[PDB]
Amino acid sequence: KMIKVKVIGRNIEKEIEWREGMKVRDILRAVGFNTESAIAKVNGKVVLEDDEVKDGDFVEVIPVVSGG
């Protein structure tokens, strides 16, 4: 299971396998970030740092201020 990281709505696609026993947090750990810089949302659904991802969830980290 590998992770992908993008800056809130920064446009960062990179397909990504997945694995067994791990968690959202870890994949975010592949960023060296249990997501600190952000709010996370997989498939358009919102989550917390511990609310897993699944499937090669990316990672979003950066001033997630959607309003521009």
Curated annotation (Swiss-Prot):
Modifications the protein undergoes after translation, according to the UniProt entry: The C-terminal glycine is likely acyl-adenylated (-COAMP) by UbaA, and also probably thiocarboxylated (-COSH) to function in sulfur transfer.
Presence of the UniProt keyword Chloroplast in the record: no
Covalent cross-link (Glycyl lysine isopeptide (Gly-Lys) (interchain with K-? in acceptor proteins)), residues: G68
InterPro entries membership: Beta-grasp_dom_sf, Mopterin_synth/thiamin_S_b, ThiS/MoaD-like
Modified residues (1-thioglycine): G68
Family matches, as Gene3D superfamilies: 3.10.20.30
Cross-link (Glycyl lysine isopeptide (Lys-Gly) (interchain with G-Cter in SAMP2)): K54
GO terms assigned for molecular function: nucleotide binding
Pfam families, A to Z: ThiS
In-chain residues carrying the UniProt-annotated modification Glycyl adenylate: G68
Keywords of this entry: Isopeptide bond, Nucleotide-binding, Phosphoprotein, Ubl conjugation, Ubl conjugation pathway
Function field: Functions as a protein modifier covalently attached to lysine residues of substrate proteins, as well as a sulfur carrier in tRNA thiolation. The protein modification process is termed sampylation and involves the formation of an isopeptide bond between the SAMP2 C-terminal glycine carboxylate and the epsilon-amino group of lysine residues on target proteins. Is able to form polymeric chains with itself likely at Lys-54, similar to ubiquitin and other ubiquitin-like proteins. May serve as a proteolytic signal in the cell to target proteins for degradation by proteasomes.
Protein name: Small archaeal modifier protein 2
